[PDB]
Amino acid sequence: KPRNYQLELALPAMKGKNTIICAPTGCGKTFVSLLICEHHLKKFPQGQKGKVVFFANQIPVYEQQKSVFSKYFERHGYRVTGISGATAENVPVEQIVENNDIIILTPQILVNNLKKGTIPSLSIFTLMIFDECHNTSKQHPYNMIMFNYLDQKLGGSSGPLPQVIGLTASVGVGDAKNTDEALDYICKLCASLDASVIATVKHNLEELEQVVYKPQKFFRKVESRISDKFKYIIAQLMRDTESLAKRICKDLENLSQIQNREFGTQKYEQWIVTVQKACMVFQMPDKDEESRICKALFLYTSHLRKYNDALIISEHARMKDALDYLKDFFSNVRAAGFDEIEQDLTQRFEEKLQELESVSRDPSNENPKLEDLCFILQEEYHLNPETITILFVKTRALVDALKNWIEGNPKLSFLKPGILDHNILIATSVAQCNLVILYEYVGNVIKGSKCFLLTSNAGVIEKEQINMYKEKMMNDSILRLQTWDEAVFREKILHIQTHEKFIRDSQEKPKPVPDKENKKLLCRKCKALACYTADVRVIEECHYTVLGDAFKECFVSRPHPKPKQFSSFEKRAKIFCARQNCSHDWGIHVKYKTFEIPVIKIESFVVEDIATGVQTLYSKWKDFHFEKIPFDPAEM
RNA sequence: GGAUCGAUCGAUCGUUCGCGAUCGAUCGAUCC
Ligand SMILES: [Zn+2]
Numbered sequence: 268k269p270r271n272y273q274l275e276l277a278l279p280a281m282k283g284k285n286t287i288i289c290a291p292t293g294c295g296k297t298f299v300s301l302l303i304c305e306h307h308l309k310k311f312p313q314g315q316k317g318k319v320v321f322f323a324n325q326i327p328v329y330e331q332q333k334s335v336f337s338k339y340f341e342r343h344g345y346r347v348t349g350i351s352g353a354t355a356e357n358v359p360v361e362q363i364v365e366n367n368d369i370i371i372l373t374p375q376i377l378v379n380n381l382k383k384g385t386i387p388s389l390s391i392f393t394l395m396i397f398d399e400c401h402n403t404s405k406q407h408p409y410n411m412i413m414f415n416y417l418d419q420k421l422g423g424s425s426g427p428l429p430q431v432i433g434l435t436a437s438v439g440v441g442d443a444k445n446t447d448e449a450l451d452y453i454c455k456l457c458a459s460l461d462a463s464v465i466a467t468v469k470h471n472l473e474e475l476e477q478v479v480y481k482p483q484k485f486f487r488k489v490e491s492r493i494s495d496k497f498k499y500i501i502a503q504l505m506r507d508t509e510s511l512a513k514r515i516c517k518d519l520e521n522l523s524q525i526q527n528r529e530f531g532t533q534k535y536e537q538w539i540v541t542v543q544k545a546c547m548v549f550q551m552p553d554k555d556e557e558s559r560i561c562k563a564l565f566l567y568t569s570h571l572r573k574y575n576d577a578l579i580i581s582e583h584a585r586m587k588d589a590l591d592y593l594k595d596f597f598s599n600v601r602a603a604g605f606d607e608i609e610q611d612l613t614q615r616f617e618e619k620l621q622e623l624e625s626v627s628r629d630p631s632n633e634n635p636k637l638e639d640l641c642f643i644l645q646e647e648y649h650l651n652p653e654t655i656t657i658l659f660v661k662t663r664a665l666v667d668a669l670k671n672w673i674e675g676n677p678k679l680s681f682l683k684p685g686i687l688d689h690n691i692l693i694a695t696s697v698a699q700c701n702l703v704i705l706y707e708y709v710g711n712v713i714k715g716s717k718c719f720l721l722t723s724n725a726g727v728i729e730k731e732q733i734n735m736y737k738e739k740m741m742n743d744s745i746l747r748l749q750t751w752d753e754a755v756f757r758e759k760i761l762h763i764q765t766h767e768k769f770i771r772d773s774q775e776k777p778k779p780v781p782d783k784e785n786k787k788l789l790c791r792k793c794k795a796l797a798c799y800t801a802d803v804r805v806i807e808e809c810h811y812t813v814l815g816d817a818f819k820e821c822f823v824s825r826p827h828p829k830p831k832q833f834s835s836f837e838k839r840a841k842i843f844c845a846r847q848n849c850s851h852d853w854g855i856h857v858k859y860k861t862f863e864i865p866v867i868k869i870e871s872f873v874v875e876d877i878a879t880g881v882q883t884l885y886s887k888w889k890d891f892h893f894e895k896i897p898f899d900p901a902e903m
Numbered sequence: 904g905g906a907u908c909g910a911u912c913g914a915u916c917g918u919u920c921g922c923g924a925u926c927g928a929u930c931g932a933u934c935c
Contacts, residue, residue, distance in 0.1 A: 325934080376935075525914060541913090661911080833905090854904065857904075
């Protein structure tokens with residue numbers, strides 16, 4: 268049974284104009300979209316049929332929307348199906364669209380089809396319902412659909428142009444500082460969705476006040492540790508590793524020019540990966556000791572990165588998890604690495620391991636952040652013993668660390684590990700949500716509850732304060748835009764989307780000139796010859812592979828831990844560099860149609876030209892420019 | 904494998920305020 272709040276939300280898009288309907292609850296969002304769909308299909312006279320498309324960006328929400336739509340739009344003689352990645356293989360999407368009314372297709376499918384050629388005009392549909400439409404920022408699938416829509420609208424060939432009603436919960440803030448910029452951002456979002464009304468509950472505010480789901484803020488600024496003996500030991504090990512790495516690279520400080528570096532920080536990680544990317548371009552003409560020196564610096568730099576991550580984990584999470592993480596890394600890479608460089612580094616680590624284990628088991632070196640975390644958890648749990656809480660950490664190296672700390676803490680017994688009969692649900696990003704804890708993690712909260720923010724920096728505190736200020740500013744700007752009439756808003760959005768179309772069509776890249784030289788690829792940590800670009804074939808303008816049989820013996824197969832097909836191939840195993848001690852992540856082994864193909868990634872490669880002898884480095888395939896010969900199945 | 908979004912950090916230019924802007928790196932999440 269619809270209520271007055273539903274009808275007040277659904278009022279402006281009822282008349283036949285595009286809206287930015289924003290309801291916070293998910294059930295309310297589903298209900299307003301359902302009512303809009305029902306009255307859009309009911310208002311059509313005989314002989315004409317609607318083709319409403321509902322866009323869902325997530326697979327579980329696609330399942331949920333398809334379920335509710337097929338449960339409600341079932342007795343009315345309406346045909347409803349849906350498309351996804353595991354459904355759209357060799358299936359005539361044109362036949363579905365021409366013979367369905369309430370397709371609940373995901374947006375990437377429509378982008379792929381519009382780029383392919385199928386479904387040429389966007390006027391086939393009549394009602395586009397975007398779920399969580401605030402994601403339309405730049406180059407998104409929603410924004411690609413809107414690009415094609417605006418291309419169709421502003422090209423002078425406007426036909427039965429479908430409604431593009433957007434549905435959300437928060438209209439979004441962007442990076443606003445003052446109300447003019449927030450108003451400009453809201454107008455830009457509205458014009459990108461091409462709507463002139465923003466539906467928002469105003470006359471039935473107590474309907475939302477009945478169920479609002481808003482928490483209170485409970486900032487707890489904490490102090491870091493002071494007796495950082497372990498940080499001293501790991502810093503000494505860092506200094507030793509870097510000094511012995513400097514024996515083979517005299518100018519190691521000069522490859523990266525940023526600033527002075529300090530251990531246990533993200534800046535050190537950036538310096539580590541920059542100097543990692545720096546030394547894989549060496550041009551020593553021996554080509555045999557070049558492999559060993561490149562392997563040596565890769566091993567040293569990967570070790571330094573691992574110690575830096577261990578330092579970060581020890582700074583944030585508890586001690587023993589950081590030590591066990593380092594021991595696990597040394598166990599997994601020791602089981603693969605058997606050279607004397609690994610022998611030296613590993614023997615240095617076990618030489619320090621006795622001191623590390625002695626300093627790890629000291630209760631006097633407990634982190635105060637976890638101390639007052641369990642202290643606030645204990646007071647609130649003694650206040651309420653049926654409360655399920657959710658804790659957010661920034662990194663996946665900490666979600667298991669906090670779970671281990673929960674399991675190994677004897678001061679608490681009511682908690683259960685909830686890695687995402689489950690008391691506390693430890694997760695990293697995203698039910699009842701009766702308690703939310705943000706441990707050193709800055710992000711979104713709007714997605715008798717409480718929100719305890721724990722941090723060792725006041726930057727997060729001032730960031731959240733200006734986040735509340737920008738939320739208030741966005742609400743005021745929304746009310747100001749709702750004050751306006753239909754005309755001036757319409758030519759304002761028309762001018763700004765004309766400007767957006769101008770810059771979008773102006774910012775077009777030409778075709779890169781393909782080189783006429785046969786440049787080749789080499790492994791990252793090994794610098795051995797992998798394959799020339801003349802034997803590289805591109806499948807669907809995104810994936811690349813090698814068709815030579817000499818390449819087939821250059822790698823080895825390792826079974827994939829998480830294999831899953833994506834609409835074109837199916838994944839069987841990863842390919843690794845088959846050398847003495849390389850074991851580097853080259854790519855992945857799939858089947859496209861019948862053949863087995865090892866599709867590779869240029870991220871873990873270094874490309875050199877046979878003529879000039881320079882080893883340049885690329886990170887993604889689009890930046891790499893060469894004669895992309897298409898893959899022909901007639902060869903092999 | 905490929906593309907996309909979000910958060911942190913760093914480099915470069917323009918104005919000595921608050922900063923604005925192209926590029927880059929790490930971590931997390933989604934879809935194909
Ligand atoms: Zn290799």
